[PDB]
Every structure is written in C-alpha cells, then in structure tokens.
A paper describes a structure:
Mupirocin, a clinically used natural antibiotic, inhibits isoleucyl-tRNA synthetase (IleRS), an enzyme that links isoleucine to its tRNAIle for protein synthesis. Two IleRSs, mupirocin-sensitive IleRS1 and resistant IleRS2, coexist in bacteria. Specifically, type 1 proteins (IleRS1) are strongly inhibited by mupirocin (Ki in low nanomolar range), while IleRS2, which are homologous to IleRSs from the eukaryote cytosol, exhibit resistance to mupirocin concentrations that are about three orders of magnitude higher. AARSs catalyze the formation of AA-tRNA in two steps within the same active site.
To understand how IleRS2, but not IleRS1, accommodates the non-canonical motif, we used X-ray crystallography to determine the structures of a pair of IleRS enzymes from the same organism. Apart from wild-type PmIleRS1 and PmIleRS2, both of which harbor the canonical HXGH motif, we also structurally characterized their corresponding GXHH mutants, all in complex with a non-hydrolyzable analog of the isoleucyl-adenylate reaction intermediate, Ile-AMS. The insights into why IleRS2, but not IleRS1, can tolerate the non-canonical signature motif came from the crystal structures of the pair of PmIleRS1 and PmIleRS2, both in complex with Ile-AMS.
Residue numbers in the entry: 1 to 921
Amino acid sequence: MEYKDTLLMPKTEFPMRGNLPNREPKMQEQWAEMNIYEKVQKRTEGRPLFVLHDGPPYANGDIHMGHALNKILKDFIVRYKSMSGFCAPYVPGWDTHGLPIETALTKNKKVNRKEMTVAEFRKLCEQYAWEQVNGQREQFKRLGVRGDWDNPYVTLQPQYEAQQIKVFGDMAKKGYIYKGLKPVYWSPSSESALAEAEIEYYDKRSASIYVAFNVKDGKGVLEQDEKFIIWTTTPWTMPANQGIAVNPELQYSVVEADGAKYVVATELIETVAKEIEWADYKTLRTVKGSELERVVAEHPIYKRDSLVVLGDHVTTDAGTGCVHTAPGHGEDDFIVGQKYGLEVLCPVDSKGHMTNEAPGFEGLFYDKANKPITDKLEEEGALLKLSFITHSYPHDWRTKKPTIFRATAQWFASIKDFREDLLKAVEKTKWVPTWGETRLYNMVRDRGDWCISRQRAWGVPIPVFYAENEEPIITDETIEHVSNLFREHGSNVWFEREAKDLLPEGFTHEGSPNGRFTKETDIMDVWFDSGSSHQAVLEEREDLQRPADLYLEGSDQYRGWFNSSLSTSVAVTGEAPYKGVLSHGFALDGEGRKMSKSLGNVVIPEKVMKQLGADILRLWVASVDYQADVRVSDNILKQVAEVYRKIRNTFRFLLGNLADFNPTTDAVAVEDLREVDRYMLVKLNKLIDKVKKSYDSYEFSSIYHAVHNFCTIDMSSFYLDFAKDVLYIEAENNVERRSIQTVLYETLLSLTKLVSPILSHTADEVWVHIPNVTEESVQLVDMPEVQEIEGADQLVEKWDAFMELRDEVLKALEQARNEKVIGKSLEAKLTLYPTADTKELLASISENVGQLFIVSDLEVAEGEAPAEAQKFSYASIVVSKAEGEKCERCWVVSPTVGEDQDHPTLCTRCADVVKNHYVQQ
Ligand SMILES: CC[C@H](C)[C@H](N)C(=O)NS(=O)(=O)NC[C@H]1O[C@@H](n2cnc3c(N)ncnc32)[C@H](O)[C@@H]1O
Ligand SMILES: CC[C@H](C)[C@H](N)C(=O)NS(=O)(=O)NC[C@H]1O[C@@H](n2cnc3c(N)ncnc32)[C@H](O)[C@@H]1O
Ligand SMILES: [Cl-]
Ligand SMILES: [Cl-]
Ligand SMILES: [Cl-]
Ligand SMILES: [Cl-]
Ligand SMILES: [Li+]
Ligand code: NA
Ligand code: NA
Ligand code: NA
Ligand SMILES: [Zn+2]
C-alpha cells in the first residue's frame, strides 16, 4: 500500500511447495500425448547411435526399489546421450519364461501344475505374464522413464522364440551343443536340473560323519585289520558309494591304532584325533598314497566292493585323506569314476526319494534317510564319530529349498571348446567398476559345461529330434523349420504336435528306416532365453544394432545376463555383444540390511511415488554410489527431499526476479558485464563442463553434490542474496540489474538443460517458464556446450578470495546478530581495517563494495585499534550505526533522505528511480 511500491517476485507461476505426487502424473500425460520418445528419436535419426540394451526383468510381480534403480540409471544415460550428439534408442524388455513365473502362480494363486494339462498351465503362465508386464510398464512410467513402451520385446513373442532357436542352432552347428549323463545340480522341490545362476547359497546344518571301510584285499600293503576312515557331510550319498579316493604322490598316509588300526593321511593325525576323540594313538608305518592304488575295500552296510582310486581332487583341508567316492552324486567323483570305469549309481529319484538302488532305505527322502543310514552304520560298527556343522549350501533360487547333485542325462553347452574366446572378449570389454572384468574372467576360467536342459513346461523347448536309432537329430534344415514354425505359431506348437509334424515336409534320416521319429520334452534355461536377446533384439530390430555400447544391470548378473549373453554371442559371433558394462549394487535399508518384509524394511516404490514423488527418487539415485551397495530409508529420502526443497527454492527465485527481463535483445555483452557477474559466468561454465564429464564417466554422485553446492551456498547464499535487494530497486533498464539477470538467464537456460537427464518433471516445469521457448520440452535441445571466458583464471583467483572475505564479513554481521543490537545487515555501516593483502584486493574491486556486502556504507582506514570488536585473520572490522534517515523504499540508512522535495522520505537513489521513467510507465 503506502509502505510498499511493488518490486517483488512476479513469476510465482512455479509454486514454492512441491506437490509433485499430484502434479507429475499430469506432466506425464502431456509427454505421452506428444510422443516425446519418437520426437527425440526422429530428431537424432542421423546422429551416431549409442545403444543401451535393456536387460529383461522378470514378470514375477510388481517392481521393487532395485527395479527402479536399474531403470533410472538407464534413463540417465539414455537422456544424456540423446541430447549430446548421439541417437539413444531405448526399448524395454521382460524375461517371461522360467520358474520365476511358474513358482509365482503355484504359490500365490494356489494352482497345481499337475492338476492341469501342460498346455493349460502354459496358458495360465502366459496370462499372468501379460498382466505383470502391463503393471510393471505403468509403474516404470510413473517413475519417469522414457522408452519405446508401446513396442517392447517379451520372451514369449514368436519372433524372439524363432531367433532363440537360431541361436541354439548356430552353436549346435559349431559343435558347442552335446548331451551326456553327468552329475549336475538337482532341485527335488522343482524336480528339475539347475545351474549356478539358478542357485542361492544359505547356511544349512549337516551331520558330519567319520566312518570306517573294511579292507578285503590289501594287495600286499594292508591287512584285514586296517580300516579306512571317511569324512562325509552327506550321509545320503553313502548308498551310492563305488570307491575311495586318496592322493597318490603329494600325500602319504599312515596307520594309527586306538584299539584298532585305521588308515588316514599323515598330516591329519592330530585333526582326526580331536574329532573322533581318540585317547591314545600310535603310528605303525607310512605308505605313499600311490602305493594304495587298486586296493579293494568293503561297503560298511552292503559289504560290496569299493575300489581305492587315485585323484588330484582329494585335499589335506578335508577331514581325512580318504574321500567317499559316489560317481552319481559328485563332479570330481564322476571324473575319477569314469577314469577307473566305476559304476554310476544314483539311488535318488527326481523327487529326492531313495529308489530300489538303495535296498534298506527305499522310498525315503534323502535328508530324512540320513539318520537311518547312521543307525545302520552304527549297527555294523563302522561309524566312528557323529557331529553337526553349519555351512553354506546350494538352494533352489525359487523354492529356497536345498539342491543335490544327481548324475542324469542333460543337454550342455560346451564352454570348454571356446573358453579362450570368452576370455578374450572379457579382456576387450570396458568394465565399470573395474573389478567386474576379473569377476567374469574368473567365472569363465573355472566354469564347467553349462547345463541348459530344464524339466519344466513354461519355456522354449529344445529343438532336438530322435530317430529309431535314438540318435539326436540337429541340423540347419530342422533348426530353420522349427524356427519359422515358432515364428508363426509360437513355442506352443511344439507341445501340441508329434515329431513328424514338426519336421521338414520330406525329411528322412538314416537312423530310422521306417520314418518314425520322436521329439525332446525338456525346455531351455531361462537364462538362455535372456542370453539370446542380442540376436533377437539388437540384431533383428532395425532400431538397434549389435554389439550394444553398454549393459547396465545388477551385480548378480555376472553369473546371469552378463555371462549368458557373452556365452551365446561369442559362441556364434566370437565377439562380445556389448562394448561396455556398468554394474550397480543392491538396495538395502538404512542399517545395511536386505529389504525383506520379514524385517519390515521394504521401501515400496509406489509408497514413495505418492508420498514424495518421482524426482526425489531420481535425486536419490544420483545421490548414492550405485556401483556399490546402496542403502535407502524413509529418513534418507526425506533428506533428499529437503535437498530438492533447496533446489526448488533456488529455481523459483531464479524464475521470480527474472520475470521483468526479455533476453531477445536486452542482452548485456560479456565485456559490459560486471566482473562479479563475469566470475559467475566462469563458474557456470565450469559447472557445465564438470556435469557433462561426470555423465560421460557415469559419476552421478558428483553431479548431485556439485549442483547442491552450486545452489545452497554459491548462488542462494552469496550471489542471489546480494541480488535480493539490488535487482528490483534499481531501474529496470539499468545495466547493473540487466547484466546480473543475463547471468541468471544463462544459468536458468543451462541448468534446466543440464538437469534434464536426472530430473525431468521439474526440468520441463521450469522449461515452461522460459522467455525463449524454441523447443516444446527441455529434452528436445542439446546439453549446453562449455564456452571459454577471457581472463577467467585471474578473475577466479580474485573473486574466490572475494567470496572468502565476504563470508568473513557475513560472520562479523552474524556476530552483530548475536548481539542483535542493530539486528540488521543493510542498515549497518562498516569501518574496515584490512591487511595489505586485503587492502590490495579491495583496491582491485571496481564495483561497489557496499552493495556487494549489502551494507549501507563502508569506510577503509588503517586505524589499527582492535578495541574489543573483532579481527579476522585478514581484516579488523567495526560494525557501526549510520544514524542517518532510513529510506522507506530501499531501507538503506542514508543522509541523502530529505534532499528531494517531492520525496522527502526517500534517498537520492530511490527518488531518482521513482521520478524518472525510461520510455514508459
Ligand atoms: C528334516 C528335519 C529337519 C531338517 C530338522 N530341523 C533337523 O533334522 N534338524 S537337525 O538339527 O537334526 N539337522 C541335522 C542335519 O543332519 C541330519 N541328521 C540329523 N540327525 C542325524 C543323525 N542322527 N544321523 C545322521 N544325520 C542326521 C538332518 O537330516 C539334518 O540335515
Ligand atoms: C537382466 C535381468 C535378468 C535377465 C533377470 N530377468 C533378472 O534378474 N530379473 S529381476 O527382475 O530379478 N532383476 C532385474 C534387475 O534388477 C536387479 N535387482 C534385483 N534385485 C535388486 C535389488 N534388491 N537391488 C538392486 N537391484 C536389484 C538385478 O540385478 C537386475 O539388474
Ligand atoms: Cl510345483
Ligand atoms: Cl563330503
Ligand atoms: Cl499332431
Ligand atoms: Cl512325439
Ligand atoms: Li529436515
Ligand atoms: Na486346480
Ligand atoms: Na528326453
Ligand atoms: Na518332461
Ligand atoms: Zn532508497
């Protein structure tokens, strides 16, 4: 009214309190209406392509915080490359087959796969799949992820299944596919084989056994009174024993007497004495391990022949130098068993129950038969000691129940035949973090052959036929026919036709003169479905190319997608399907614990999406070291939300006091700018260069703090703080405020473009309040390009010292605020006693120091009288009262108030501004 003369923040069109949860959905509505993904893709249609191939998440259910972190990090890279001279097509995907879907339906929906036909259960899996891919798609959109959502890929599509058969066929033609009876992981709960990617390790309690094997034929080395000692944590494997293993040359065993003579490795005498609790024991003689070859022993229960074998797998670290060898339940046992032609015995069926191969324990679950086995061992007297240990044990990745080794006929990919090319691909790939290279390298050099056959329904069947010779039929014509047949009708055609209707129209094989063929029923590993994505997506789709330039998935994918995709591509191409890998850790609670509902620490993405919003989560992703494990909690997100509050206030302030400025022609030249403004221009360009470099190096934590530092202290507390009382009081065409707001315009234009990859809900919201809008959204322009500023280094040194000195002056003002006598900064007059260095810097100031320090008046003298006021290390300061008339407009205490007859209550500055008009008003 009479006290105020406007000159406030006009543009409140950007609200202060951020109600993103109710505003962001409307923001996404306009993005979908304009089809912004197609716009940026069309704009960069001729630019070089940077492909970030999306790892297909499972459709097991709704998204968790880990899903969001994956997509948000992908969105950061794609958005930056879209507006940095690259074409960045991003198509989502979904891994649809496998146990993650069957187990979800079986447990949650209480359906029984054995109460319905295979076709019916597969149809139910297909229904639940599309339900989840639709639900996950909308949840990703709410987060604010840009991509080809209307045209994604799923693993159940016939085109994908057709190409996956081609991938399998190409490897088979190379000779990398074979079938054999080998021990592999078995899940009795799922009644199927498994691989390491389908295995989770948990601590499990197992019974430790020290058992004795009697000697029948010592071959002139041992008498019948000696007995071998065996340590085993798997009692159920005893009925399958066919031999005993000992190290031939490196380890020499001895005979120990504790009332009876036992055979044990020499280096384990003390360790075996404390376990069996021997009282008095004496060594008889020493025998080299190789001398014990072909010694015949007896089974403690069945008294069958057990052949002592030589192998390098037996170690001193075990409980005894002799190891029970069961070729049907162990990798190393199978290898040595085949070396000596030992029988392969697997008395355990697919459901984990003992079969007729174990006479005294038939029908028992393997874990439930451990106690009866020990009881029979103790009845025979061969049991020495029984104990219990807890150790990490493999478990099914879906049923969470333990797995066992079973020797069964399975399909394998011969990794050993091209392991060298796999190692070369890892060495030629760029890994971020760096340890990822050694992570996958060692996983390959120590990997065995990959079991790819699964005894389940929901998946892609293995395209192998069998003739009357029972010879597997794999050839390019059969592979081509089934691939085209799958492309038309899908994988369902395999489960609804006999073999002769799935073959070429006139195919005949030598092994079956009658033309009577049969088909395979096992399906492929779900990791093979995802590992064929590069051939079916990067190669088949025209919008993408192979190899992709980056893979971005979690740390668990080194066993999974990173490994399987490399295996299929190097088998076919010989080269890696990716030029680089970016790895992110897992999401944890505030105390570094797994987010499980059991702990009650789950941070639901939808929970944060509605309580806080999307850009808050986007900042949180950029606020953490994703490359390692990340910890999240509601309190942490509130801190991130508070940071967004400071960012939002700075943007509102920048938009507000910039309203009365049109930079179309009111642009102040760089030479005409204030040296104070020129320093901010240098700082802005340094910020642009650092942010763009950080995007290239993928260091988002640097961007998060750099922007936070640039706004909280550098701009809002130092530069905008001065402009809070200078911009609007002066004339609206004054070169001072016009030049300052050219800097504000440059910051607003550049910062809005910089933040666009990380935050877009607020970036486009600010982009609306831009005087010069040549593109509909901020995502349609490129990132700002750094521009050199003349005399930058000299001004950086000068004004960084000036910033330091101002902070000390503010500290002196805050000391006066502690006194609260003046209780004001602008009204206070200053008498300064600077150091020669400080005095030289003040002399170099060509601007008004009074307005910079937001003080009424400043005088400089070498009084050198400290009194009791203050003295900074570079200047002595006195905060004095001016005692003049206070202006009613600028609030500056100035003696000039009253000199103007028309405005006796205004100073000369305010009186001149009020009286004079530039051209109008
Ligand atoms: C199937 C029953 C559960 C696993 C039960 N918690 C249980 O067995 N708990 S335990 O503490 O006995 N676990 C010991 C492990 O060793 C086996 N075991 C237990 N008692 C004996 C025994 N007397 N002789 C041989 N093996 C035995 C169990 O199968 C379990 O894996
Ligand atoms: C590339 C994806 C694989 C082929 C597989 N479908 C898969 O892992 N599917 S998933 O849906 O379970 N996971 C997809 C991505 O999410 C990561 N992830 C899973 N759980 C978490 C977690 N708790 N914290 C952080 N990231 C996590 C996976 O590593 C993968 O990148
Ligand atoms: Cl089941
Ligand atoms: Cl063992
Ligand atoms: Cl048929
Ligand atoms: Cl058939
Ligand atoms: Li707070
Ligand atoms: Na049913
Ligand atoms: Na079969
Ligand atoms: Na089957
Ligand atoms: Zn005034």
